[PDB]
């Protein structure tokens, strides 16, 4: 999805094999907040939310708690107390097009900043002045969104990155999403310290 209109997928009632995401070298960014990246399997949550979007390289730094900027404030904002992991990778060879991939847009103009995880997808022409735009662009009437010129010839700061943020939410609930469990071979006819489920 476009960063102004990020795609939230809800993950629930499943086994979260966080080890795959952690162990692979496919990611350039793996920033965990409030949790340890190697202990993610032991953390049980009610909901895991995967927010999927594309931004340019220079803006990858904005996908974090406490950050400000065009993305952090007008497109995809994370709370200062965000709990979860931000995972991102260079997608230059996936999204960029020779003539420019302009299907990805971000918000430049807004009346105010976004609340954490607020998804504002309005396309109303932004009124910078006191004169109503009435559907017409012009002086002080600007379309709030702009496209990214993603091209295979761009420098890294202007290459697309695919970002997935896994937000970890614990509610007054059973906590249905946990990682895989360890298991060993069964040993018979010997004294062992055992653990069968609980």
């Amino acid at each position, epitope marked *: 999805a476009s960063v102004y209109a990020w795609n939230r997928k809800r993950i629930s009632n499943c086994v979260a094999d966080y080890s795959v995401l952690y162990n692979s070298a496919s990611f350039s960014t793996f920033k965990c907040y409030g949790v340890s990246p190697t202990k993610l399997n032991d953390l049980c949550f009610t909901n895991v939310y995967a927010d999927s979007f594309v931004i340019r390289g220079d803006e990858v730094r904005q996908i974090a708690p406490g950050q400000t900027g065009k993305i952090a404030d007008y497109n995809y904002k994370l709370p200062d107390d965000f709990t979860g992991c931000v995972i991102a990778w260079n997608s230059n060879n996936l999204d960029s097009k020779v003539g420019g991939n302009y299907n990805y847009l971000y918000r430049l103009f807004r009346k105010s900043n976004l609340k954490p995880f607020e998804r504002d997808i309005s396309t109303e022409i932004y009124q910078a002045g006191s*004169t109503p735009c009435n559907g017409v662009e012009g002086f002080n009437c600007y379309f709030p969104l702009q496209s990214y010129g993603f091209q295979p010839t761009n420098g890294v700061g202007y290459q697309p990155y695919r970002v997935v943020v896994l937000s970890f939410e614990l509610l007054h609930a059973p906590a249905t999403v946990c990682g895989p469990k360890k298991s060993t071979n069964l040993v018979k006819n010997k004294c062992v310290n055992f653990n069968f489920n609980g």
Partner: antibody
Amino acid sequence: VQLVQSGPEVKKPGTSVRVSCKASGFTFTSSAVQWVRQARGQRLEWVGWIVVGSGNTNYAQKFHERVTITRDMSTSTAYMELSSLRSEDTAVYYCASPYCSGGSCSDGFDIWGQGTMVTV
Amino acid sequence: IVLTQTPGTLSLSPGERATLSCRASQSVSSSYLAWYQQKPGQAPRLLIYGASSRATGIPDRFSGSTDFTLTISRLEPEDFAVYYCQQYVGLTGWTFGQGT
């Protein structure tokens, strides 16, 4: 709150000139900059403009084909380049912007550069 | 658009009032017309925007209002300048009048 214009230029016919203005004291990135020119003893003519935020441009039809306007937010500067220069392009160039504070902008071009002569 | 600015020259002694006029070649929104004051040798400044509103720093010697006008309630020595109208309707077709 000032828009500071670059110094004068002397160019040959058939070449190009680059002029620029730096914004200071105001929210350049939410603003817009227009470029105009005036020959001595003549009327002020519109050349074109850019929205700083979006980077989108529009031009006067008489210059359109040979004029490009751009910007670089990292230095709060608006730029204009005129190609295929003619002797008739000898004029004082001016730049202007509305005053902006965050997302709130004025309703006209209050901030003007001092004016710079380009000779061809 | 094409804007017509009249009179070509406004000759009037200080202490008196002056009337300036700008004519559109088509019906336009008043919200996009502005008036400028150009003291010779200097960049122009905005006086009136949105046809009727005063710009910051503009004294009550001036006031705003296809036919649009600029009124100078009273002339002081510093109010002798070439006046221009400018139209910003839409993204293109922006222009200035000839200058008073």
